[PDB]
């Protein structure tokens, strides 16, 4: 009762102003994604040259997926952390996450920086079409 009657004086809201971040933060998120895509490309080129060495207990396909997922996950988390740095004290998403009433750091990260990798059945999106995920992509594309 008492806190809800104080909330009439203070008030709470959620708006687009909360989702939007500083321009510098957007540039940092974009740079993280750029270098991550480059790293995935380097891993792919190593795999094509057969320079990649299999992880013990794993096939070369499995270890390639492991390394690619590690690079993408690190980029995803780093962009999320940059977005969470950008949040001001007044930001209401942060109010709800810090108080614990609803939401999580992951939700803020997806709202502001990067939605993240989509995984189905524990793997990246599979090749539903013949050797490609969607008709628009080129055959044998393991890129991000």
């Amino acid at each position: 009762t008492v806190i809800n009657n104080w909330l009439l004086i203070e008030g709470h809201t959620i708006g687009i102003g909360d989702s939007i971040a500083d321009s510098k933060t957007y540039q940092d998120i974009q740079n993280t994604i750029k270098k991550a895509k480059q790293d995935v490309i380097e891993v792919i080129e190593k795999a094509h040259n057969n320079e990649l060495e299999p992880t013990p207990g794993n096939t070369l396909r499995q270890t390639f997926e492991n390394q690619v997922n590690r690079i993408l996950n690190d980029a995803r988390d780093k962009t999320g952390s940059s977005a969470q740095k950008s949040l001001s004290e007044y930001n209401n998403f942060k109010s709800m996450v810090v108080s614990g009433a609803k939401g999580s750091k992951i939700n803020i990260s997806q709202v502001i920086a990067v939605v993240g990798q989509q995984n189905v059945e524990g793997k990246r999106i599979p090749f539903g079409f013949k050797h490609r995920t969607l008709p628009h992509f080129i055959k044998d594309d393991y890129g991000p």
């Binding site: 997922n69 993408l72 996950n73 995803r76 992951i106 997806q110 939605v115 993240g116 990798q117 989509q118 995984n119 189905v120 524990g122 793997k123 990246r124």
Partner: peptide, 8 residues
């Protein structure tokens, strides 16, 4: 929808 270790 996040990653392989998270949720879909």
């Amino acid at each position: 929808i996040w990653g392989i270790g998270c949720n879909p």
